Design a binder for this molecule. Structure first.
Ligand SMILES: *[C@@H]1O[C@H](CO)[C@@H](O[C@@H]2O[C@H](CO)[C@@H](O)[C@H](O)[C@H]2NC(C)=O)[C@H](O)[C@H]1NC(C)=O
Ligand SMILES: *[C@@H]1O[C@H](CO)[C@@H](O[C@@H]2O[C@H](CO)[C@@H](O)[C@H](O)[C@H]2NC(C)=O)[C@H](O)[C@H]1NC(C)=O
Ligand SMILES: *[C@@H]1O[C@H](CO)[C@@H](O[C@@H]2O[C@H](CO)[C@@H](O)[C@H](O)[C@H]2NC(C)=O)[C@H](O)[C@H]1NC(C)=O
Ligand SMILES: *[C@@H]1O[C@H](CO)[C@@H](O[C@@H]2O[C@H](CO)[C@@H](O)[C@H](O)[C@H]2NC(C)=O)[C@H](O)[C@H]1NC(C)=O
Ligand SMILES: *[C@@H]1O[C@H](CO)[C@@H](O[C@@H]2O[C@H](CO)[C@@H](O)[C@H](O)[C@H]2NC(C)=O)[C@H](O)[C@H]1NC(C)=O
Ligand SMILES: C[C@@H](N[C@H]1CCN(c2ccc(CC(=O)O)cc2)C1)c1cccc2ccccc12
Ligand SMILES: C[C@@H](N[C@H]1CCN(c2ccc(CC(=O)O)cc2)C1)c1cccc2ccccc12
Ligand SMILES: N[C@@H](Cc1c[nH]c2ccccc12)C(=O)O
Ligand SMILES: N[C@@H](Cc1c[nH]c2ccccc12)C(=O)O
Ligand SMILES: *[C@@H]1O[C@H](CO)[C@@H](O)[C@H](O)[C@H]1NC(C)=O
Ligand SMILES: *[C@@H]1O[C@H](CO)[C@@H](O)[C@H](O)[C@H]1NC(C)=O
Ligand SMILES: *[C@@H]1O[C@H](CO)[C@@H](O)[C@H](O)[C@H]1NC(C)=O
Ligand SMILES: *[C@@H]1O[C@H](CO)[C@@H](O)[C@H](O)[C@H]1NC(C)=O
Ligand SMILES: *[C@@H]1O[C@H](CO)[C@@H](O)[C@H](O)[C@H]1NC(C)=O
Ligand SMILES: [Ca+2]
Ligand SMILES: [Ca+2]
Ligand SMILES: [Ca+2]
Ligand SMILES: [Ca+2]
Lengths: 821, 804
């Protein structure tokens, strides 16, 4: 009773089966103008038939063993679901036919069989729908393929168990693979069912913690219409993201792949979930230029030893218990069995045709089917061997094996721990789950046959700690089926050393602009968020990748200018010392004795101090040299001017008594200098505001009226000396001294007046060189005006140094005779 | 047959119904050490019993009316689901017991046949019931299930609903958040088929409008202590104040109880429709946490005899309602004697106890139940009045009302269009849905008894054009129950003008810092992502809000410096004209023909030209003053130098010829200036790179070689005349003028060497000043020591003293 096409065999204990022998149903959703009929399954699935044969082979192998359930046989009733909720519910209503009559008091045939457990429901929505109806009657349901996390809820799904791991490790592993290859710009596609939606939600939650930006997220279906598919295609080809993560199955993904292949969209990196990473619907050679280089997940393979020889024994006339063998024979050989295609014989050979039935290389879901059947058999064997007094039920009492009920088998399945043929331990946890490792594979092209080869490139170990679970061998991956270069999948290129990041408005964090830093700031590492302002006495490059030290500007002792000015100063000091020496040697003579013999000594000492006071303007301006820069020249030159002015002419008649005048004339300068240095002294000053890349060192004078008073006092005494010596230029005594005094005063005023435009233009820039040159020029002019004339008669023409020449000049000059050479 | 507690009446045509009379089932763990019993239902639900009474009132009203299905009765079988999939699945297997026997080909043979089911409340229960009812094409009309996943007609073939689905609601929450200008919110969903698509649609709509979501959590009714503690810790670690909740009342009650136990105040709760009017959550003792909630409600309908029917209920007079006895026990808190808690009597008054049964303002879900029943009956009436030859079936054939089948009822339900008691039109679309408006409520506190009052503060109009659907009256909102101020729920504070948003690493784009703008760039808006560049002739102000105009710089008139230079030039022109006038006055005295008096006229005219040539430097250069700046002074000063050098000693004997030897040395310079002006003319220039804040206006010379030749010829002529006047400085003829020529050339060379460091140092306004001052000083010195001694001799010294 129930569906017609089935696999059935009698026994003492009956198991139920649910497998997708067809991929789907015929699209015939029309109005109800006639009474509705049964739908028609459309596309044959050879892999599902192999799964059904795995369950049949496991049952036969259990029934031949004397060590597992002796003297009682197992039977089966297996139906087709066609990947559809409605066919599975039609089969499940016949699974619970005995139990439902008792609950509804409906009463009658009294010869209907009871199933104790159900193996089946590949797809997760089909699994949830079957689990809802089976959990009413506490019938256990072991699934070989459904991996949704929503079926781990034991409040709603009381009797559901799995031989496959659930999909949360897979989503975490997908995030880990994206993190390993250093991408941050991806798109996601999931199937709109109970399988794709929670997996892609877990992947989104994991990708948010690892700073991965997701651009698009779309949903697809097997029964999607055309305009939805073109909306998804325009969403895909409007993005610059290359990596697409797909959580779907084969028949749910086929129309989108067909539309993408038709439009020739190339260069995408597909990350596949386990449900389509080995599908024969997607892995076609004609699709390769779109789907080459896919990276995907696989489960761990197992060995069922005599299974291939069992698969090679199928026949339509010999399989009396398998009602699916006839259509399998017709779809393999494209023929028709009697009772337009030609008539089948039974002589045809399975090895001649290439379908996924016997052309596989690893058993993964088939091993899960085998493990499910053996789990149920080991729970039954635990029932059979249990000793009175040590059971799992009330008082420690044992179930009866000849009247066994389904809830007792479910209770024994919750406490199961057995060893399989691989020598590993199979137990289920509190949520009914079962952990396992993952293999990581990559799609290649076969050079010989042209088909698609699945190459193992890594693994995911679930028993390691978080962060150390992934292994990938990068050298074995071909990236679009041909290339050895890891692709670029970021939103924007990396900012370089001279730049920083900038926000683009309305766009996520992974997309940024690269902005040049300003003239004062730098950056050194790659993806900077801000330019660091490096501290004082530093400035950036022209390229802003670092910053370098500023340049300190001042006049030092090692410049050529400094050596030249030092040589001129030392030569002046040597010449003045030479003149003092010849005055000391050739004394007691009328030329020296006529020049008062004591004012000349102090005049030469003043000239020595005025020459040596120009050395404070060269070097680094410190706090104390800036205090003695200006007063040193200010007192030395006024001492020299007073020594010149005291000796000239009848001004001494206006009132030794000569020295007191010099004493007052330099003591006034001494007191104004000491009150200036005690009220507000000058000090050094590091100027950075004039030019950006150069620190000047200059001197701030403090007060300004004190400096004006100093220069005014010196110019006042110079003008008084010039005026009083300007009257007396016609007296031809002492070798015409007053003419040279007026010449020296004129030289002083001309130099310090003509140096005015040089002083105001380059103010703040090395003006101390100008201040050295003016001092040296004035000192040289005064010394050469006063002493060299008398030196020429004293040294090179003696016996003219006589009293008769001082009182009456004999008209012979030094400079004309020296210029005559 | 089936479940024991039921409501049941007989009839010709039988409808089915599913309502939650209890809030859930007893939380017990099955160790499976004995055979499992049936689970027990707990926490009576008075609103659900009112919902069940709506269906019976509708069916009795239809049965008493002669204008709708005459001579034909309706019956019912109604069961309790307890918000659970398994109880509803037992009830649904009781519904389909006739149809399933024929499909399996599998005793009583008098089994009644259900032709339609009034649906469930929650979407998981509706999906599980619809999966089984679609196998037999039995129509199912739900009054409350609003999930989008039930709009898929490939999976759910026979499902209809009188409630709008949740996509408009999830768009409306994002519209509310956009209206109050928030960008930093959190979400909480219930882990079922109701909360997950609602929060997914909200997340997509909020990412469309630049709203950043901080956290996202799932809750349930059966969450334990550690999950609730984790969710409360996730809430308490976040600065987001606005929280959007998509859940029902039973699924949200444990989280709310734990938040109340910790006194977490200050959050802004945004309520979906399932818990926005829930008595489990809207309690006075929770008002310090969930006060001021803004939520959604459906539109209210009117059923004009329904309250009287609700008050006619009785445990011993309702013989078709099995749910009345437990209602009566739970209302009056007693025990009913069958056929401490006191013994109930039959004489109690329903108005004495405040339960949600007759304590309501508006009928919203009850009106949906009423519409579901009337939709089914109007489909049956459309069957009953079909005319032969115009049916909906094959060849235009009509179904038979005495032998009706459920697929024909579903076919007529897909083509239904009728008018209701409120005067609106009821049709279902191709996905089986029905749109409707929303009302927006705010949770206040009553000053009378302390209960929670729902106040209407706006609407959402789904018939309007997108972007114009929301209306909010803000003056009626009390935030947190007491405050009249809109709260702040942004991640970061705003950056003002003169600042730029800077990135914080590892954080979303709604969180940023503020960095000041650079010197040459400006930003006037707030929350500016970058500084904008000022234009070419503009610079930014002191806080970089707007560009101000760049200052221009040149030596100008009405400046004090330019006025002083102009007064000195006018004074020089005046005294040179005085000297010329005195010389033309005494043109017939011996001391004037002592020199060549025709040459001194040319010398004084060239001195006038040399004074007048200095006025071209002052003012703004206008691209023709730059052409006449340098050649005018060049030719005037070489005319002065040649006029001096002709009259010196022993050059005129070398060679009337004086004017020719003037003409050659001025014609050479005229040739140089005219070649320079014809080949590469000077041009004006606006210099901007010297200061980057001021624009200097200068003259680009155009050629340096020609300017070098122009200077060098003048220097050469000055050197030759200096040498030829230096050889004969001791001669006393012409009042010792050779030493004065020597002094004039010495002054010229001293000034033009003294002003050379002022050309390599300063660059702006102050260079034209020194070009005026050097010209003035050189020409003043030349004129002074050439024509002052003779002027003293003629004028101030007596003319009787040595004029012969
Ligand atoms: C993909 O991008 C294209 C290119 O911009 C979009 O096409 C344009 O869309 C705008 C928006 O209304 C229209 O004004 C233009 O007329 C469209 N141009 C063309 C050539 O169609 C397109 O809408 C985008 N699609 C998706 C799904 O985002
Ligand atoms: C693409 O973007 C990622 C994410 O920012 C970059 O990965 C960073 O690379 C730098 C340099 O190697 C590391 O210091 C960071 O730790 C990486 N971040 C993360 C989260 O792993 C990646 O370098 C970018 N790729 C390209 C080609 O620009
Ligand atoms: C919180 O952030 C939002 C941005 O998401 C701000 O809204 C902007 O406000 C400015 C000025 O008030 C408007 O010019 C923009 O058009 C608004 N943008 C949007 C998208 O609405 C909001 O002002 C911020 N709130 C506070 C208190 O700073
Ligand atoms: C919420 O914030 C608290 C406060 O930091 C976190 O508690 C600390 O977590 C760190 C890291 O796990 C521990 O080292 C500390 O001992 C914790 N306690 C304290 C008092 O600092 C808590 O982990 C956060 N929770 C969530 C869900 O974010
Ligand atoms: C949904 O709400 C809108 C606005 O609340 C209703 O439109 C109003 O209809 C009345 C009468 O038809 C008019 O007087 C108002 O001017 C309308 N307002 C606006 C803003 O258009 C609309 O009728 C409601 N729809 C339903 C089905 O009740
Ligand atoms: C070395 C100099 N110091 C600096 C300070 C400003 N400066 C300066 C330059 C030119 C003039 C025009 C003028 O009056 O001829 C006036 C001043 C030069 C100095 C120090 C002390 C006394 C001085 C006495 C007389 C001249 C120089 C003096
Ligand atoms: C008034 C003077 N003007 C000349 C003097 C120096 N000057 C100048 C201008 C620009 C640069 C290059 C730069 O800075 O880009 C260099 C020099 C401009 C003048 C005019 C004509 C003949 C003269 C004969 C003798 C002395 C002066 C003469
Ligand atoms: N995990 C899938 C089922 C599945 C696993 N592997 C497969 C291979 C082929 C087809 C389906 C599958 C689901 O729950 O829906
Ligand atoms: N829409 C809710 C059901 C619902 C609507 N309004 C309600 C009021 C109270 C309880 C439940 C509801 C769901 O699908 O789950
Ligand atoms: C299963 O059995 C093995 C040995 O019999 C034991 O080591 C292991 O812990 C058991 N597993 C569980 C989950 O009890
Ligand atoms: C999982 O993978 C790791 C690493 O390859 C391996 O050591 C471990 O044994 C595997 N686990 C199982 C159960 O096979
Ligand atoms: C900038 O220029 C310098 C030398 O000109 C060079 O060494 C440096 O690498 C450059 N920086 C960048 C980021 O190109
Ligand atoms: C329903 O009937 C009314 C009355 O004629 C009509 O205006 C309206 O368009 C109809 N609606 C549909 C969906 O046919
Ligand atoms: C700029 O800032 C100053 C003080 O910091 C203030 O006086 C002035 O008004 C500001 N200008 C603008 C345009 O805000
Ligand atoms: Ca056996
Ligand atoms: Ca955006
Ligand atoms: Ca009637
Ligand atoms: Ca983050």
């Amino acid at each position: 009773y129930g569906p017609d096409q089935r696999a059935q065999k009698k026994g003492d204990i009956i198991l139920g089966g649910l497998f997708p022998i067809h991929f789907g149903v015929a699209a015939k959703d029309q109005d109800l103008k006639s009474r509705p009929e049964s739908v028609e399954c459309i596309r044959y699935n050879f892999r599902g038939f192999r799964w059904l044969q795995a369950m049949i082979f496991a049952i036969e192998e259990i029934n031949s063993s004397p060590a597992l359930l002796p003297n009682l046989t197992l039977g089966y009733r297996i139906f087709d679901t066609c990947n559809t909720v409605s066919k599975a519910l039609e089969a499940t209503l016949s699974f619970v036919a005995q139990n439902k009559i008792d609950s509804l008091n409906l009463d009658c045939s009294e010869h209907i069989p009871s199933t104790i457990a159900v193996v089946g429901a590949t797809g997760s929505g089909v699994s949830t729908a079957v689990a809802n109806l089976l959990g009413l009657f506490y019938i256990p349901q072991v699934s070989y393929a459904s991996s949704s996390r929503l079926l781990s809820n034991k409040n709603q799904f009381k009797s559901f168990l799995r031989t496959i791991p659930n999909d949360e490790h897979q989503a975490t592993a997908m995030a880990d693979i994206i993190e390993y290859f250093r991408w941050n710009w991806v798109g996601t596609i999931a199937a709109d069912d109970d399988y794709g939606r929670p997996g892609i939600e877990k992947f989104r939650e994991e990708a948010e913690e690892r700073d991965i930006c997701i651009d698009f997220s779309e949903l697809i279906s097997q029964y999607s219409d055309e305009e939805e598919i073109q909306h998804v295609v325009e969403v895909i080809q409007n993005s610059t993201a290359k990596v697409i993560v797909v959580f779907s199955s084969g028949p749910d993904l086929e129309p989108l792949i067909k539309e993408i292949v038709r439009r020739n969209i190339t260069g995408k990196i597909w990350l596949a979930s386990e449900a389509w990473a080995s599908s024969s619907l997607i892995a076609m050679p004609q699709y390769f230029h779109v789907v080459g280089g896919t990276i995907g997940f696989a489960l761990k393979a197992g060995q069922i030893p005599g299974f291939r020889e069992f698969l090679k024994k199928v026949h339509p006339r010999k399989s009396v218990h398998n009602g699916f063998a006839k259509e399998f024979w017709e779809e393999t050989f494209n023929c028709h069995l009697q009772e337009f295609r030609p008539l089948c014989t039974g002589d045809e050979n399975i090895s001649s045709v290439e379908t996924p039935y016997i052309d596989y290389t690893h058993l993964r879901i088939s091993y899960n089917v085998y493990l499910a059947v053996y789990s149920i058999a080991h729970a039954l064997q635990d029932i059979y061997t249990c000793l009175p007094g040590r059971g799992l039920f009330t008082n420690g009492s044992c179930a009866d094996i000849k009247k066994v009920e389904a809830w007792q088998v479910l209770k024994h399945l919750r406490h199961l721990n057995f060893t399989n043929n691989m020598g590993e331990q199979v137990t289920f946890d509190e949520c009914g789950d079962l952990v396992g490792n993952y293999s990581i594979i990559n799609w290649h092209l076969s050079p010989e046959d042209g088909s698609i080869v699945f190459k193992e490139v890594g693994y995911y170990n679930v028993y390691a700690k978080k962060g150390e679970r992934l292994f990938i061998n990068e050298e074995k991956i071909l990236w679009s089926g041909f290339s050895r270069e890891v692709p670029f999948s970021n939103c924007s290129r990396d900012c370089l050393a001279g730049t920083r990041k900038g926000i683009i408005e309305g766009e996520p964090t992974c997309c940024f602009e690269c902005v040049e830093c300003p003239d004062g700031e730098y950056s050194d590492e790659t993806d900077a968020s801000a330019c660091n302002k490096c501290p004082d006495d530093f400035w950036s490059n022209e390229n802003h990748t670092s910053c370098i030290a500023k340049e300190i500007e001042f006049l030092s002792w090692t410049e050529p200018f400094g050596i030249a000015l030092t040589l001129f100063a030392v030569l002046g000091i040597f010449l003045t010392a030479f003149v003092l020496g010849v005055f000391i040697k050739f004394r007691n003579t009328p030329i020296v004795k006529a020049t008062n013999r004591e004012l000349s000594y102090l005049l030469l000492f003043s000239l020595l101090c005025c020459f040596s006071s120009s050395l404070f303007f060269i070097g680094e301006p410190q706090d104390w040299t800036c205090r003695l820069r200006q007063p040193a020249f200010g007192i030395s030159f006024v001492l020299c001017i007073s020594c010149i002015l005291v000796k000239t002419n009848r001004v001494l008649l206006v009132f030794n008594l000569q020295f007191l005048l010099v004493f007052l004339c330099t003591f006034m300068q001494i007191v104004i200098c000491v009150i200036w240095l005690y009220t507000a002294p000058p000090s050094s000053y590091r100027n950075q505001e004039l030019e950006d890349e150069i620190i000047f060192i200059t001197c701030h004078e403090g007060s300004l009226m004190a400096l004006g008073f100093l220069i005014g006092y010196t110019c006042l005494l110079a003008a008084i000396c010039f005026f009083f010596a300007f009257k007396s230029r016609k007296l031809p005594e002492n070798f015409n001294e007053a003419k040279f005094i007026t010449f020296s005063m004129l030289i002083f005023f001309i130099v310090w007046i003509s140096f005015i435009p040089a002083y105001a233009s380059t103010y703040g820039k090395f003006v101390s060189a100008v201040e050295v040159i003016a001092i040296l020029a004035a000192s040289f002019g005064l010394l050469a005006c006063i002493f060299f004339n008398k030196i020429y008669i004293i040294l090179f023409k003696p016996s003219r140094n006589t009293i008769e020449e001082v009182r009456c000049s004999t008209a012979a000059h030094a400079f004309k005779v020296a210029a005559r050479a």
